[PDB]
Write a protein that binds this DNA or RNA. Structure first.
Ligand SMILES: C[C@H](CCC(=O)NCCC[N+](C)(C)C[C@H](O)CS(=O)(=O)O)[C@H]1CC[C@H]2[C@@H]3[C@H](O)C[C@@H]4C[C@H](O)CC[C@]4(C)[C@H]3C[C@H](O)[C@]12C
Ligand SMILES: [Mg+2]
Ligand SMILES: [Zn+2]
Ligand SMILES: [Zn+2]
Lengths: 79, 98, 1336, 100
DNA sequence: CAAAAAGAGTATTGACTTAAAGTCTAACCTATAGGATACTTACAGCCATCGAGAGGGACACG
DNA sequence: CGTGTCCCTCTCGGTAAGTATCCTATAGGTTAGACTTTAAGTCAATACTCTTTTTG
């Protein structure tokens, strides 16, 4: 669960980009194309996304790299 | 009192007054200033488009919520269209351009 | 989608393009079968079908026939929502003027033709003729005739002469004019005239003509020929239950228009006599002008309600128009109210939400979770499971509210802490439970208050509520960086009572082994909570590189302070809880935990304070009784002495020793002095009533009185609420404002009798009738502050500026009202703040001065620091992040994007409900002088020959402690550079004397002195001295008026004594009423006196400073520096001439003759220096002294109001409003730019226009900065939508239509109205992405 | 009311709108009748989509679909009747009964 | 494995009743015209009492 | 030919309940109701073919 989000802010700065990155990741995990990188503890996708932000396994560049890898995989699997 | 979805008004398709006709809470101008003083741009946008006035967006949002997807497709409020028609029914020609 | 909104006039062709048909009948529906009759206001073949995919007759009735048009009734088969979008039109039988473009005060029709509105209304009323291109034979073009004159002209000219009447004549005048020719003739005529008024009038008309040429509009489109009609579903005729209908007033207005238009067509087809036809045309012109704007021209038409029916323009304007009632704030789904209660068991990130309320707000979330689990087959089955409240829909409800915040909002939202996000806890009941610590932010007590909860739906609104609006993030105030979750009243009395010491309690003096033993003793009853003991505590100080270091010592403390030490976190010192711990000591205990430890330790610590303050206030058993109000035993003697001192001044009034205005002030002065003796006899009795024994002998101590402790700890009480319970209530004021002589010498423990309880109600209804309308003048000031600054946003990171503001401590004349630390904390330095050892700097030139950098400035005693300011930022359309500084409720710098213009207007407007001879040194320091000329007086001391001398007190540390203003002609009892002692008078002067003191010594000659014209015979009958007073201009003779009496200093050898430095004569022109005392031929000393010339609001004051109101008696400033002179007199205005040494000399001003001047015709005046005295206008400070001096004036004259009521507001928030006031500019030299001379262009627009030119080889235009009020800078903006939604919708839409204005949607109001992401916070990235792909 | 704030027009609601509870039931019925028709033969999943205008334009009568398949009018009435007969059976009608 | 017999699917013809139009008639609304002693200027809602500030237009004077 | 002053104007901060009005005669449009027609849904019997069963 969450009480304060200060660790996520000091990981991803500006306090407004954090909301966007966390919403992007939470939407990735919600419409279930993906599964969390962190052990979920009944946390919703918002809290799981923030916990992934805190530990540094998810940020904007990580999401962009994974998205580009997915786009390359789809093209290479088009046949 | 509590409301999620009920009856909407006639000219401006907005919820009605409190607890006699199952009406919503007024999110007035000072609350809009309070949400602008934070950075809550998405909360404000769902306050003034999907929760209140956009006719297609509120049905889409209800279907999304009951389908387990929390995503908004905002559109443009009906009150702005009413305002455009009322200004345009004077001699003045106001229009949206791109 | 769209990127801009464009507004203009509509051609008749455009109006016929919008329409789907012509409305030809006034009928609405059939009275028997309520179907829309054709073809009236409600027509199915014009405005669409009444039912979805059905014809009117019924031949086509399904979606298989979509788009087809019935051959019988003509109704298209489509959706019935097209009746909200399809318009019609009315073909008027005669042209009709548009009331907006005629009856607006500028009168675009009137000033486009250069024809006065009084002479146009005569033509529109069919009571005068006007020629229309009548040839160059006898009459002019726009010459007005009458019936007789037109008859004569017709009898004299049968052709080549056209003069019409009515709106046809006005339309012909508007159509026959050539705009380019008129504009060029006006431009030629502009240079010929030099009168300012003619220049302004011609410039206005040329501006209008250019606005008409540049846009696509035509002049004759301001006269209606085709009138559009609104879609029917926007003016409905819906039936109520009971057979009766409800209609809009637009139906009545349109029916009147159509009836009169049809009758006019009928009369024209009948060849009626012209009086009837003219009357019908006047009636039609009345009907249309009442439809567009009712009541503007003539009297308002009223309906059957006997009320003026609402027109088209009344649906857009006002507090209940479309803009303010339906676009800027709406009714919202997923919301509800309930009463709030305490629930003190909560954590400050969570609230208590009833199960009944949470079952309705989260209704769709439960419908979609029952089917996911398979508990319900369909949406209709899940709708009935929660309808009968099955036992499984409560287990589902706990899953949908786990990490889902809700927004709690209290009805007056004065600042942004009025909306906060909490995590709901499901409780059984009907009242919301609100954490005790967040009540100060909401300003909410529990005596009937209500709150509205709002449910964030989308996945981004649940992350803004958690990351931005959560209640654990808002613990500091955005107005001043101070805590806002301070413990309030019951927890601050439990921490005060626990942390106190009693002289001899249980278990005193015993040595404890730690805080855990002190609690084992108290709980088992072996020791008292106030027992002076020695405990061994281990405290951690993190003065290492972030590492905690332990230190163990044996502390002298009490049992209660050891028990509280188990709550305080690691890195805090033990002296934080080793005191009595009132209310201020608890608020700084949380502030020195946010700075040292951070946010997460403070949030946990703020709840443990609340839990341990509620717990030990209950164990206290602190009550209130009638014996706790201890009346002094001397109160009966203090009053009896004051009643025997008003009976001796009553006798002196009858004996004539004192007048009426003196015994009234000698009775108040002894009742206000006997009120300070009763209140000092109880407070010295209450505060130490406890005297107890130590070691046998008695010993006094601080009292444990139940009412003293509630006031000594700050727990809901003061020393003025007391002294009305145990002292006396003192002097009361009658409603006229006077103070009654005899006070009310009783209190609330003894009781007020009938006569003195009635008196204490004049001041009780007056105090209740003020707060009932102080909220209407404070809620309107904060609305104008938001709308002038809503568009300001941090849009950059560093603009690279070196300009700034010099910050100094505020010294009103006595104590320092605001030290340097408060005025400099969290601001970026503009230049290197070098230490007094100037060989090396102290801080760099871009350091954010936080708590640590403000310690060096205090140790080294820095006098002043120059910091970057918002008002001096190079960023165009926004503010740099370094020119703002600290985030102020975030400990870091401001984020790029943050909307600082709405934060700065709620911070000023929130405390608006709380708002309404000699010099004696105090400390021991050095006398300091600045901007003063020195000359020896007769007695050897120093007299001052300056007008703006400042007296200061420099202590040993080199910082200024006192600041006194020394007038002209004052004798200095000491000298500069000397270290004087406190209490010594270092300056003395006569306040009623304006000396003309000399500068040198010699003889005084009565040159140009005439007895009977200038001098009168005033012989002193007391001393015998000769008094020779000059006369004023209203009495002096005309032949002697042109003579200036002067005293040129000479000697006894026939030479001339002159002022050193230059060789000008030492002559002193004596003004009127100058008392020549010393006789001629007498040798004088230097600096000898010659003549002795005889001599706001709390809340409206803040409004007047921001509105830039000009004062009633402005002080005259000096327009240019140099040497002053004089000139010819006149009747009403005197003449003052200022001569530059090398510049243009003949500048002059018309000073009124009835104002006391301050320059003696020979002083070197400086630019922007006062000539007269009084309230100084804000505009003249900007023009003469610059930008940095008009912002210092406002932030120092508006913080005086707030500091008098104990309100802390940062100076960032006032300099943001000032920046939005000096936002326009006026061109002085057009240069190589495209700007007109008199045009008022925006400052940022003329700052980048002459930036490409200066980067190029050309030359840039120069400008003059302009200051405007908050209601004029918010109304002259580049957007007509952020200005029409504020005020004067009719006046803004009229100017934006005739100019073809285009709205780029750059602000925060435009995106709120049109329904998209504001470009401020989380939507700042979205708007930057759009500006990249747009113009890519 | 007892004030100049409330008006008669603020209490008149729009009765031409359909509730989103009713609007989300329609999108759930178009999916429930899509799986059911997929469980039938392609001939009976096409005559039922024509006898009732499902996911297309105007519905047809018995004769109008006779030309489509060259079958006579009477047999299609029986082909449709057997298609109706299959769907009444359980294990293909449980979810459908929740819509009544 | 292979042949005879019964049950069921698929496509027909001949009545046999049924809802949806198509049409004729009447009866009942609905729009229009006409009325000849002589009659000739309505009013009333600025029947109201707030203040406070800004802007423009007309008068008078230097 | 140009400032100062005063006056006028503009903008800002369940309801509702009455006033008399007449009257007569023609001709045409509108609807509504019942009779009749027609495309449409229905049932009863049936022949053929395929499948399925039963039997030695
Ligand atoms: C006065 C009160 C509002 C509280 C203030 C109540 C009492 C009478 C109520 C209205 C009337 O029934 C007429 C009307 C019936 C239509 O069907 C549409 C609703 C209307 C507006 C009703 C809604 C409303 O509730 C009213 C105004
Ligand atoms: Mg209250
Ligand atoms: Zn039709
Ligand atoms: Zn800057």
């Amino acid at each position: 669960a969450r009480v304060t989000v200060q660790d996520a802010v000091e990981k991803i700065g500006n306090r407004f980009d954090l909301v966007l990155v966390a919403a992007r990741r939470a939407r990735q995990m919600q419409v279930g194309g993906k599964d969390p990188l962190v052990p979920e503890e009944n946390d919703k996708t918002t809290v799981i996304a923030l916990r992934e932000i805190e530990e540094g396994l998810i940020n904007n560049q990580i999401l962009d790299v994974r998205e580009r890898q997915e786009q390359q995989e789809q093209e290479a699997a088009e046949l | 009192h509590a409301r999620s979805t009920g009856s909407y008004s006639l000219v401006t398709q907005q919820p009605l007054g409190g607890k006699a006709q199952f009406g919503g809470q007024r999110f007035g101008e000072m609350e809009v200033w309070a949400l602008e003083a934070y950075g809550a741009a998405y909360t404000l946008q769902e306050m003034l488009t999907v929760k209140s006035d956009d006719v297609n967006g509120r049905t889409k949002m209800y279907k999304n919520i009951v389908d387990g997807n929390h995503q908004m497709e905002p559109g443009m409020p009906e009150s702005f269209n009413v305002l455009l028609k009322e200004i345009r029914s004077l001699g003045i020609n106001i229009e949206l351009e791109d | 989608e769209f990127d801009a909104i464009k507004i203009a006039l509509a051609s008749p062709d455009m109006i016929r393009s919008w329409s789907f048909g012509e409305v030809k009948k006034p009928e609405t529906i059939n009275y028997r079968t309520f179907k829309p009759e054709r073809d009236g206001l409600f027509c199915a073949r014009i405005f669409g079908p009444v039912k979805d995919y059905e014809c009117l007759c019924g031949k086509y009735k399904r979606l298989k026939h979509r788009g087809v048009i019935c051959e019988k009734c003509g109704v298209e088969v489509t959706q019935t929502k097209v009746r909200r979008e399809r318009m019609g039109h009315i073909e008027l039988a005669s042209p009709t003027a548009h009331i907006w473009f005629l009856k607006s005060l500028p009168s675009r029709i009137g000033l486009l033709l250069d024809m006065p509105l009084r002479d146009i209304e005569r033509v529109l009323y069919f009571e005068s003729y006007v020629v229309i291109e009548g040839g160059m034979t006898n009459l002019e073009r726009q010459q007005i005739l009458t019936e007789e004159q037109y008859l004569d002209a017709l009898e004299e000219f049968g052709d080549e002469f056209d003069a019409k009447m009515g709106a046809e004549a006005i339309q012909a005048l508007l159509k026959s004019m050539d705009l380019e020719q008129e504009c060029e003739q006006l431009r030629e005529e502009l240079n010929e005239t030099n009168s300012e008024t003619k220049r302004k009038k011609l410039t206005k008309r040329i501006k209008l003509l250019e606005a008409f040429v540049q846009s696509g509009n035509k002049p004759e489109w301001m006269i209606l020929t085709v009138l559009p009609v609104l879609p029917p579903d926007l003016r409905p005729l819906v039936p109520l239950d009971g057979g009766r209908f409800a209609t809009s007033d637009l139906n009545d207005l349109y029916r009147r228009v159509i009836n009169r238009n049809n009758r006019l067509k009928r009369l024209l087809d009948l060849a009626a006599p012209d009086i009837i036809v003219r009357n019908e045309k006047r009636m039609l012109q009345e009907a249309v002008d009442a439809l567009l704007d009712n009541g503007r021209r003539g009297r308002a038409i009223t309906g059957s309600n006997k009320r003026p029916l609402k027109s088209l323009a009344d649906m857009i304007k006002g507090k209940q128009g479309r803009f303010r009632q339906n676009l800027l704030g709406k009714r919202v789904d997923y919301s509800g109210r309930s009463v709030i209660t305490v629930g003190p068991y909560l954590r400050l990130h969570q609230c208590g939400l009833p199960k009944k309320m949470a079952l309705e707000l989260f209704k769709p979330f439960i419908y979609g979770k029952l089917e996911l689990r398979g508990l319900a087959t369909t949406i209709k089955a899940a709708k009935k499971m929660v309808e009968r409240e099955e036992a499984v829909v409560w287990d589902i409800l706990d899953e949908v509210i786990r990490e889902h915040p809700v927004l709690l909002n209290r009805a007056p939202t004065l600042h942004r802490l009025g909306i906060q996000a909490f995590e709901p806890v499901l409780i059984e009941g009907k009242a919301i439970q609100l954490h005790p610590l967040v009540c100060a932010a909401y300003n909410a007590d529990f005596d009937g208050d209500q709150m509205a909860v709002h449910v964030p739906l989308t996945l981004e609104a649940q992350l803004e509520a958690r990351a931005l609006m959560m209640s654990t993030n808002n613990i500091l105030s955005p107005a001043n960086g101070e805590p806002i979750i301070v413990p309030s009243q019951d927890v601050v009395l439990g921490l005060y009572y626990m942390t106190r010491d009693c002289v001899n309690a249980k278990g005193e003096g015993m040595v404890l082994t730690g805080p855990k033993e002190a609690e084992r003793l108290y709980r088992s009853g072996l020791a008292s909570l106030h027992a002076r003991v020695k405990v061994r505590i281990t405290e951690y100080e993190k003065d290492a590189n972030g590492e905690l270091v332990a230190k163990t010592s044996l502390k002298d403390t009490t049992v209660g302070r050891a028990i509280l030490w188990m709550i305080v976190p690691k890195g805090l010192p033990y002296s934080i809880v080793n005191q009595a711990l009132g209310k201020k000591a608890i608020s700084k205990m949380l502030n020195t935990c946010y700075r040292i430890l951070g946010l997460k330790p403070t949030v946990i610590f703020a709840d443990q304070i609340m839990y341990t303050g509620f717990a030990y206030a209950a164990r206290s058993g602190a009550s209130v009784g009638i014996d706790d109000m201890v009346i002094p035993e001397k109160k009966h003697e203090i009053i009896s002495e004051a009643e025997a001192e008003v009976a001796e001044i009553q006798e002196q009034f009858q004996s004539g020793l004192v007048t009426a205005g003196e015994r009234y002030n000698k009775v108040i002065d002894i009742w206000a002095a006997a009120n300070d003796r009763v209140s000092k006899a109880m407070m010295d009795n209450l505060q130490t009533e406890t005297v107890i024994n130590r070691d046998g002998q008695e010993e006094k101590q601080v009292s444990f009185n139940s009412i003293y402790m509630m006031a000594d700890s700050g727990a809901r009480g003061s020393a003025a609420q007391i002294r009305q319970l145990a002292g006396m209530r003192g002097l009361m004021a009658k409603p006229d404002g006077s103070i009654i002589e005899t006070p009310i010498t009783a209190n609330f423990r003894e009781g007020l009798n009938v006569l003195q309880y009635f008196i204490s109600t004049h001041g009780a209804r007056k105090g209740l009738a003020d707060t009932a309308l102080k909220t209407a003048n404070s809620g309107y000031l904060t609305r104008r502050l938001v709308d002038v600054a809503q568009d300001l946003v941090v849009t950059e990171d560093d603009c690279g500026t070196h300009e700034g503001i010099m910050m100094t401590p505020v010294i009103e004349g006595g104590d320092v009202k605001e030290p340097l630390r408060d005025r400099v904390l969290g601001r970026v330095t503009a230049e290197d703040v070098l230490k007094p050892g100037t060989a090396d700097i102290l801080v760099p030139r871009n350091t954010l001065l936080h708590e640590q950098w403000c310690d060096l400035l205090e140790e080294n005693s820095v006098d002043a620091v120059k910091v970057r300011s918002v008002v001096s930022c190079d960023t165009d359309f926004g503010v740099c992040a370094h020119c703002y500084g600290r985030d102020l409720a975030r400990g870091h710098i401001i984020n790029k994007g943050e909307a600082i213009g709405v934060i700065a207007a709620q911070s000023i407007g929130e405390p608006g409900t709380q708002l309404t001879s000699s010099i004696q040194v105090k400390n021991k320091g050095s006398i300091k002088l600045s901007n003063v000329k020195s000359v020896v007086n007769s007695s050897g001391k120093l007299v001052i020959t300056s007008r703006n001398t400042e007296l200061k007190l420099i202590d040993e540390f080199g910082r200024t402690k006192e600041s006194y203003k020394v007038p002209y002609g004052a004798v200095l009892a000491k000298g500069d550079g000397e270290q004087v002692a406190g209490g010594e008078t270092v300056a003395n002067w006569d306040p009623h004397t304006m000396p003309v003191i000399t500068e040198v010594s010699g003889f005084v000659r009565f040159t140009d002195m005439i007895d009977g014209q200038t001098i009168t015979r005033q012989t002193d009958e007391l001393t015998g001295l000769s008094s020779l007073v000059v006369l004023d201009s209203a009495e002096r003779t005309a032949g002697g008026k042109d003579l200036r009496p002067a005293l040129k200093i000479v000697d006894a050898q026939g030479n001339d004594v002159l002022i050193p430095g230059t060789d000008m004569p030492a002559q002193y022109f004596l003004p009127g009423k100058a008392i020549v005392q010393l006789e001629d031929g007498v040798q004088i000393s230097s600096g000898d006196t010659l003549a002795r010339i005889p001599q706001t609001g709390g809340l409206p004051r803040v409004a007047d400073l921001f509105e830039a109101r000009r004062p009633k008696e402005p002080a005259i400033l000096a327009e240019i520096s140099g040497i002053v002179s004089f000139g010819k007199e006149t009747k009403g205005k005197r003449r003052l001439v200022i001569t530059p040494v090398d510049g243009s000399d003949p500048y002059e001003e018309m000073i009124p003759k009835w104002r006391q001047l301050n320059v003696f015709e020979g002083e070197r005046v400086e630019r922007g220096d006062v000539i007269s005295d009084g309230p100084e206008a804000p505009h003249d400070i900007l023009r003469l002294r610059g930008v940095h001096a008009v912002t210092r004036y406002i932030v120092n004259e508006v913080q005086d109001v707030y500091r008098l009521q104990g309100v802390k507001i940062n100076d960032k928030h006032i300099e943001v409003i000032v920046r939005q006031m000096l936002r326009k500019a006026t061109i002085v030299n057009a240069g190589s730019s495209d700007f007109l001379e008199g045009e008022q262009v925006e400052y940022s627009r003329v700052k980048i226009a002459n930036r490409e030119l200066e980067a190029n080889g050309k030359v840039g235009a120069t400008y003059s900065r302009d200051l405007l009020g908050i209601t004029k800078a918010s109304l002259a903006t580049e957007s007509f939508i952020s200005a029409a939604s504020f005020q004067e919708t009719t006046r803004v839409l009229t100017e934006a239509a005739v100019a073809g204005k285009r709205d780029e949607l750059r602000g925060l109001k435009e995106n709120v109205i049109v329904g998209r992401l504001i470009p401020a916070g989380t939507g700042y990235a979205y708007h930057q992405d759009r500006m990249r792909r747009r113009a890519a | 009311g007892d004030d100049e704030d409330s008006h008669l027009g603020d209490f008149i609601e729009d009765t031409t709108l359909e509730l989103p509870l009713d609007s989300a039931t329609t999108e759930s019925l178009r999916a429930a009748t899509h799986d059911v028709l997929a469980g039938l033969t392609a001939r009976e999943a096409k005559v039922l989509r024509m006898r009732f205008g499902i996911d297309m334009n105007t519905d047809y009568t018995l004769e109008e679909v006779g030309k489509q398949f060259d079958v006579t009018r009477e047999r299609i009435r029986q082909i449709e009747a057997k298609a109706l007969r299959k769907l009444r059976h359980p294990s293909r009608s449980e979810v459908l009964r929740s819509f009544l």
